[PDB]
Amino acid sequence: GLSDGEWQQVLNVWGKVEADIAGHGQEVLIRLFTGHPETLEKFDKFKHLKTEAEMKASEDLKKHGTVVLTALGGILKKKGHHEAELKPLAQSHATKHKIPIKYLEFISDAIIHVLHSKHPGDFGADAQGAMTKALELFRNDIAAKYKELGF
Ligand code: HEM
Numbered sequence: 001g002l003s004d005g006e007w008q009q010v011l012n013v014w015g016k017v018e019a020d021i022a023g024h025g026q027e028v029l030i031r032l033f034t035g036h037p038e039t040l041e042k043f044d045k046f047k048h049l050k051t052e053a054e055m056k057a058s059e060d061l062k063k064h065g066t067v068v069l070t071a072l073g074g075i076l077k078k079k080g081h082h083e084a085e086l087k088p089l090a091q092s093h094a095t096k097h098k099i100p101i102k103y104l105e106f107i108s109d110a111i112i113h114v115l116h117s118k119h120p121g122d123f124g125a126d127a128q129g130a131m132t133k134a135l136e137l138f139r140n141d142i143a144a145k146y147k148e149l150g151f
Pocket of ligand 1: 103
């Protein structure tokens with residue numbers, strides 16, 4: 001698990017995303033889409049955006065980026081006690097949305113990437129560490145609920 005120093009390190013860095021949730025989420029989602037075009041075809045309200053320009057001008061995209069970073073933030077604030085908040089995300093993405101855990105590993109990396117691009121030289125090596133372990137916590141706990149329902 002994660003220690004309290006690591007969690008505070010995780011929630012410190014989340015102070016950077018909250019200051020611009022629409023900016024960070026937009027860039028996270030665009031980073032997932034162009035690096036992994038197969039993930040875009042899971043979004044049927046973004047399936048059309050064929051270029052990085054359209055995706056950057058699209059505002060339903062910034063909206064959804066806000067709701068993914070809003071909902072992911074609220075889980076990190078649980079500090080591992082996220083079962084109530086993760087459980088319903090685990091099930092919508094397994095049954096209803098049909099989202100490979102691999103794509104949850106894709107966006108995990110995108111989030112780190114987008115932090116470095118947006119905060120180079122003040123996203124420290126311990127803070128990356130911390131943020132990685134909780135994004136890996138987050139995925140492993142989705143994964144358990146994926147296998148439980150055979151996804
Ligand atoms: C990793 C962090 C993620 C978070 C916090 C998150 C959260 C959410 C939330 C809260 C919703 C709306 C409520 C719901 O339908 O359950 C949603 C919708 C959706 N998500 Fe995620 N999600 C994540 C990852 C992904 C990834 C990686 C994909 C695909 C590559 C994906 C695909 C979708 C789709 C297709 C929808 C429906 C969007 C719509 O048509 O409105 N999600 N997500």
